Amino acid sequence: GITGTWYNQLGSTFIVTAGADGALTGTYESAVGNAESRYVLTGRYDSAPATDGSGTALGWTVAWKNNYRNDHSATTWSGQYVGGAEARINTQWLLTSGTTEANAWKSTLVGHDTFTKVKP
Amino acid sequence: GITGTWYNQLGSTFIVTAGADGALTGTYESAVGNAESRYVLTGRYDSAPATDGSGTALGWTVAWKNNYRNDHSATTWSGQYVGGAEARINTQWLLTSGTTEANAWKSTLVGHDTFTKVKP
Amino acid sequence: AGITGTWYNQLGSTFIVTAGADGALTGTYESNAESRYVLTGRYDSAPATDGSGTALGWTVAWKNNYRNDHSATTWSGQYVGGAEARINTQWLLTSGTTEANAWKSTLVGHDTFTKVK
Amino acid sequence: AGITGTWYNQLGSTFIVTAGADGALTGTYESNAESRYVLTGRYDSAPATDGSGTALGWTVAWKNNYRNDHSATTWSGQYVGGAEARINTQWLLTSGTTEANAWKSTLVGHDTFTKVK
Ligand SMILES: O=C(CCCC[C@@H]1SC[C@@H]2NC(=O)N[C@@H]21)NNc1c(-c2ccc(S(=O)(=O)N3CCOCC3)cc2)cccc1-c1ccc(S(=O)(=O)N2CCOCC2)cc1
Ligand SMILES: O=C(CCCC[C@@H]1SC[C@@H]2NC(=O)N[C@@H]21)NNc1c(-c2ccc(S(=O)(=O)N3CCOCC3)cc2)cccc1-c1ccc(S(=O)(=O)N2CCOCC2)cc1
Ligand SMILES: [Ca+2]
Ligand SMILES: [Ca+2]
């Protein structure tokens, strides 16, 4: 149920393939751009989740460098997939920027994204 | 400077290859076990970091399933590599477990790991 | 301003707070008497006038006269005024643990509070 | 118990706190007078007696008589007693933002506090 296209509340889109081995691969597009806003993503998911109605744990990373831009940053999303008629991926994320040592204390933003199969 | 073996304060070891394209691949071993405690990891890093003395942003994911165990969970680490004589990868992480909807509010642990090239 | 009163999150919890002129937040958090806990925090009592939210934070230690969970939650966020006022937060819930278990001491999450249930 | 007093973190900040019998934390955070801010929080005033830490949290809004950063930090953690006493924390720093910038409103980090600099 994970493979395909997902949309969050900020207008971002990612397109992921969930491999039988637990790999996540695909692309993440930040809301504003087209090709210039598309970045590689890779991650992992639980390919044998519980059958007790629990979600499926997963995570992925995007480094914000592509052939157009480099924001010297990387975001990781950690969350779970919840299936059904209104499938969701509920996540929390950490965005770390490369900083000097003096600024390391303010290197990392935290937030939360909810992804759905249809645009908000 | 990222490729190789790193150790954190909990006794965990990971071994990563940083690809020229920005890929991170390797294995993460939780402290206690041998093969039963080794898990696939994948991630991304900034393959063209700033040259102003800033760290190199990166992130990776481990899903805690292998051929021996499955904890129905996944951890993402977000941080930066800092080079030099005492190289470090400074991270913050999110560990999400698959949960029922009723328990989703307590699905995600947060913490921090510092990795060095030598065992603590 | 706009913060004093009763707030409700998505989980069905009730946050009753007084925002003092001095930047203090005081009140109670109900997550029945058994479920009511003291809260105290701080807010920016002179926020920007450029349309930005009002930064704030508070803590609940999960001990009252009835129960003790040996844990505490802190919420960090901002108040956003207007017709559909909100307090948008992220929180950290730390449990007392042994040193061996300290790596898994802290949960993270997010709550949105509104003025209506 | 063991919490009242002065604490120092790895960044050179100074945390001066009184832990009240009722579970209250009050004091000041210096991150000079210009750099001193009010703090208030809560702690578990009847912690477990099994070797677990004592859960606590506090907030500083970064406004004082000299400066206002339109932001607030909450620390969530636990006190660990003994010869080498510590308060181990993780924190959230939320800045007031526009709604457009709210996705990047909140920094996360960690501080360790000790009784000696
Ligand atoms: O794409 C990014 C990073 C996006 C982080 C998104 C975070 S991950 C967690 C959260 N979830 C999301 O879906 N989005 C956010 N930055 N790009 C921006 C740039 C930019 C432009 C050029 C360059 S450069 O060519 O390398 N250049 C810079 C220095 O001068 C010369 C070299 C680098 C960066 C400029 C402005 C804004 C962005 C940006 C910021 C936020 C988002 S967004 O997706 O968060 N956003 C969508 C629109 O509504 C607001 C939120 C997207 C792009
Ligand atoms: O390996 C894991 C998950 C590790 C999460 C580590 C987190 S990531 C963030 C932080 N950084 C680290 O390096 N470590 C921690 N769990 N395994 C444990 C199990 C276990 C055993 C069997 C199975 S099963 O076969 O699937 N089985 C379960 C149900 O019954 C039938 C099926 C599943 C899980 C049991 C006990 C403990 C662990 C565990 C927990 C913590 C760590 S640790 O690395 O955090 N740790 C090292 C030792 O000192 C304490 C900390 C390692 C393993
Ligand atoms: Ca930026
Ligand atoms: Ca467990």
The phi and psi torsions of D102 (rounded to 5 degrees) equal -65, -25
Asked whether the beta carbons of A59 and B63 are under 8 A apart, the reply is: yes
Query: What is the DSSP annotation of B26-93?
Result: EEEE-SS-SGGGEEEEEEEE-SS--SSS--EEEEEEEEEE-SS-EEEEEEEEEEEEE-STT-EEEEEE
Asked whether the beta carbons of D86 and D102 are under 8 A apart, the reply is: no
Beta pairing class for A70-82 and D68-80: unpaired
CA of A69 to the centre of ligand 1 (A): 9
Cβ–ligand 1 contact at A46 (below 6 Å): no
B6 labeled part of a ligand binding site: no
Question: Residues of D annotated as binding site?
Answer: 29, 37, 75, 91, 103
CA distance C76 to C93: 12
Measured CA to CA in angstroms, residue C70 lies from B38, B65, B120, D31, D55 at distances of: 34, 31, 31, 28, 6
Q: In terms of Cα–Cα distance, which of C109, D109, B12 is closest to A79?
A: C109
Instruction: Give this entry's resolution in angstroms.
Output: 1.5
D31 CB neighbours in chain C (<8 A) are none
CA distance D105 to D102: 5
Asked whether the beta carbons of C41 and D59 are under 8 A apart, the reply is: yes
| Structure obtained using | X-ray
A110 CB neighbours in chain C (<8 A) are 90, 108
Provide CB contacts within 8 A for A113, sequence distance 6+.
Answer: A8, A9, A10, A12, A77, A91, A93
What count of CB pairs under 8 Å joins C to D? 199
Q: What is the torsional sign of CA C57, C61, C62, C67?
A: negative
- Spell out the SS3 assignment of chain A: CCCEEEEECCCCEEEEEECCCCEEEEEEECCCCCHHHEEEEEEEECCCCCCCCCCEEEEEEEEEECCCCEEEEEEEEEEEEECCCCCEEEEEEEEEECCCHHHHHHCEEEEEEEEECCCC
Q: Tokens in use for C47?
A: 């926020």
CA of B31 to the centre of ligand 2 (A): 9
Q: Tokens in use for B105?
A: 């509010």
A120, HSE (Cβ side, Cα atoms, 13 Å):
13
CA distance A20 to D103: 33
Measured CA to CA in angstroms, residue A112 lies from B89, B108, D110 at distances of: 24, 12, 19
Q: Tokens in use for B38?
A: 């080794």
Q: In terms of Cα–Cα distance, which of D59, B74, B81 is closest to A49?
A: B74
CA of A97 to the centre of ligand 3 (A): 9
Q: In terms of Cα–Cα distance, which of C117, C21, C16 is closest to C60?
A: C16
CA angle, D24 then D28 then D30, to 5°: 145
Cβ–ligand 2 contact at B94 (below 6 Å): no
Other CB atoms within 10 A of residue B40 CB? 17
Asked whether the beta carbons of A64 and A70 are under 8 A apart, the reply is: yes
Asked whether the beta carbons of C94 and C108 are under 8 A apart, the reply is: no
CA distance D53 to C71: 10
Domains of chain B: 1-120 (2.40.128.30)
